[PDB]
Amino acid sequence: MLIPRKVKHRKQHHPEQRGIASGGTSVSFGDYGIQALEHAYITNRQIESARIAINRHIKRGGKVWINIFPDRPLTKKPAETRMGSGKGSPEWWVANVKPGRVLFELSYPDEKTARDALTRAIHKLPIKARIVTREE
Amino acid sequence: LIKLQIQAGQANPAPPVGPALGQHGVNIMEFCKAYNAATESQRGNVIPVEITVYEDRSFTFALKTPPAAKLLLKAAGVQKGSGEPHKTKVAKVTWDQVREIAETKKADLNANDIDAAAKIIAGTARSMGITVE
Amino acid sequence: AKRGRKKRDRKHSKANHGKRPNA
C-alpha cells in the first residue's frame, strides 16, 4: 500500500488545513477526476480503498492516476497513558488535501461507467468531492 | 388456427403432434389420417398443415411448401444449420434456383415481387447462417 | 453531552456576537 520509502524527519507537526489549493487543481492526466471541496487528511488506507473501488468497477480497462501521495506522518500516543514524556511513534501516513485539489483521475472509453466508478470512490473517501471533467 | 409442420410420413407422434385435435375434439388419429391421405406424395418435403376449429369443430386440409430456410438448406448441401450465422458460413447458395423456386412460393406468402422475394430469402439465409452469393 | 452541546451553542446569539466566555 502507498507509503514513502523514507522520510528525513520522522516526527513532524500536523499538516496545515488553511487556505485553498493553488496547485494540482485541474484534470491533466485522464478524462475525469475527483475534485475535493473540504480540507482533510486522506490516508494511505482511504487511497487504497478508493483505488480498489475504481479498479473493481472498471473491468480490465482504463487508466487511473493519483495526484496525492501520503507522506506526512501522524503520530499516536500508546493507549492508557498520561499526557507528557515525548511525542508518539508514527502511526498514519496522510496527504494533506485542500479545497480544489484533484485527488483521483480516470481515463476510460465509456462515460457512464467512469462516472459511476468515480462516485464509488467519492463515497469511500471522507471528504465532500465532485466529479470534474477535462472539458471544463 | 393451429399449424403443425411435418412431412407426409409419420402418424400420430406425440412429442411433435399432441395438438388440440387430441386435446379436445376429434380423435387424435383422424387429424393426421385425413391430413396425410390427400398429400402422401411429399417424399421428405415439409408440408405443414394449418387446421382450423369452429365453435364446435371444423377440420381443414391445408398445406404449404417447406420453410424458406429449410428450402435453402435442401438446395445448399447440408443437413444441420449453423448456430453462428455470420461467424462461420457454410455454403454460398446462388440466386438462380432461389428465383426459379420462389417465383410462386412468395407469390403465395406475400407477393411475387422477385426483388422482395430476394431480400426475404437473403434475410432467411442470413438467419440460418448459410448465406448466399 | 446535551449540556455541553447546549452551553456551547449558546454562543450563537445576536447578543454575544458569536463568542461566549468559557465556550
Partner: protein, 313 residues
Amino acid sequence: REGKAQVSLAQMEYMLPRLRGWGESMSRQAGGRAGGAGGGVGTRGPGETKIETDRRRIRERMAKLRREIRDMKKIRDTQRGSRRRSEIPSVAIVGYTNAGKSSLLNALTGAGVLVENALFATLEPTTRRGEFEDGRPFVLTDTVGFVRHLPTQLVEAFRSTLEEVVDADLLIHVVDGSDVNPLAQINAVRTVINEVVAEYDIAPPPELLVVNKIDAATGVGLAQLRRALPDAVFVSARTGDGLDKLRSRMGELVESTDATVDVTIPYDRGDLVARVHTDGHVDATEHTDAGTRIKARVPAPLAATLREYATFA
C-alpha cells in the same frame, strides 16, 4: 467479517496461555514500522497494531468476539436454509492443503473461485450448484485447508467447515501429489473427520478419493497409485485438465434417494408430460405415440401425484 473475527479470537486465545513474556517482548519494540506478526488481517490493513497488549483489553475483546460468533452462527444457519428445506444432495471437497480443491471446483462446475499458490487460499467454504450426468441439480462445496496437527487454538475458523461437511452426504477426498507420503497426508487429514463425527454424529458418509497435480506428480511414481492403491481417480493437472469419470462415479455414489419406480404418464393435457419431463429427469424416454408410454424416475411428490395414473405397461 466472519474470518476477521474468528481468526482474531483464535489469536487472542492462543495468546491467553502466553500473555506473559514474549508478548511483552514483541510489544517492547513494537512492530517498528512493520512487524513479523501483524494483527486481525496480517497483510497490512486492520491488525496493524498488535495482537495482545493489555490483559484487560484482550479479555474484553475475546468476550466481544465470542458474542460476534454467536451472532454469525445464527446468520449462517439462516443463510443455509434452502438446502435443508429442499433436501438437495450436497458434496464436499475435503483436501489437506494445496490439493487444488478450489481449482477442481472451478473445473466440473465452470466456477471461477480463486486458486492461489498457498497452503491456505480459500478462506470460507464456498459452494455452487452442479449437475450430475442426467440432472440432479445438486450442490458442491469446497473445504478450508487442514494441516497436520490441526491447531486446536484455531477451531472457530474450521467450525463452519466442519458443519458444512457433517451436513453433507458424499465426501470426495482431494490429495496433493507433492510429498512422498501421500498415505500419511490422507491418514492425517482423515484423523479429523473422526472427531468431527464424534461431535456431530449422524453417520459415516460415503467416501471417494482423488489426488490433483497429476501432470507434475508421480514423476517417479508411475501408475502404482492408480492401479494397486485403493479407490482413487485423478485427472486435474496443476492448472486444470479434463474430467472423465469423476462426474460418473460421484453420481453413482451420491444418495440415490430419487425413486426409480416406473410410472405411467398419459396424454391428457396438451403438454401434461412436460411436468415429468422437467421434474425427475427423463431417463429412458421410450416415447411411443399419442398417449406416450415411457419409464423414468420421479420424486416423492410427482410419484404421489401420478400414483393413480400408474398403469402397468
